[PDB]
Amino acid sequence: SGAIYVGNYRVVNRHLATHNDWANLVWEDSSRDLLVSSTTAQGCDTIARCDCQTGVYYCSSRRKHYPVSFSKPSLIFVEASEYYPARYQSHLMLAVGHSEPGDCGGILRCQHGVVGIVSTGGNGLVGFADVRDLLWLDEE
Numbered sequence: 465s466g467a468i469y470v471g472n473y474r475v476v477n478r479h480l481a482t483h484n485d486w487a488n489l490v491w492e493d494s495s496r497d498l499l500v501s502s503t504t505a506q507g508c509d510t511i512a513r514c515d516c517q518t519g520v521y522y523c524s525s526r527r528k529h530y531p532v533s534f535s536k537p538s539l540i541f542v543e544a545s546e547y548y549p550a551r552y553q554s555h556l557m558l559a560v561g562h563s564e565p566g567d568c569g570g571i572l573r574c575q576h577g578v579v580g581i582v583s584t585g586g587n588g589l590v591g592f593a594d595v596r597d598l599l600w601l602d603e604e
């Protein structure tokens with residue numbers, strides 16, 4: 465579990481969004497596993513605006529932050545799960561690391577701020593849904 469809190473926005477994994485998130489919806493994209501809902505109070509996370517490919521992520525199943533190298537956001541095939549059929553997930557970045565059911569939502573950060581959140585796992589890999597292209601998160 466986990467979310468990004470920037471301005472009056474809450475960014476979560478679309479497959480983990482609560483009934484309250486859907487009742488206060490701003491934007492969602494199934495192909496990216498992302499959902500953004502509105503908030504009353506202002507958040508303090510800063511979104512990275514960069515092309516960094518090294519950062520640190522939080523892994524809840526190990527209670528540990530890991531430094532990782534990660535690939536550029538791409539269209540990657542993700543196996544069928546209880547949340548989605550087998551499909552290409554877009555804006556996804558992979559790293560060699562630990563990720564198991566329960567780790568989605570963990571923040572990936574670089575020197576510039578928040579890069580994205582854990583969205584995939586298994587096979588000794590971790591996938592992160594990129595949020596650096598969502599420039600609108602910084603305004604309105």
Ligand SMILES: NC(=O)[C@H]1CCCN(C(=O)C2(c3ccoc3)CCC2)C1
Pocket residue numbers: 479497542545547548553563564565566567568583584585586
């Ligand atoms: N974005 C998606 O389509 C994911 C939805 C949740 C499940 N997904 C995973 O990759 C798995 C996982 C491992 C660790 O966290 C999650 C489930 C076994 C691998 C796929």
Ligand SMILES: [Zn+2]
Pocket residue numbers: 512513514515516574575576577
């Ligand atoms: Zn960066």
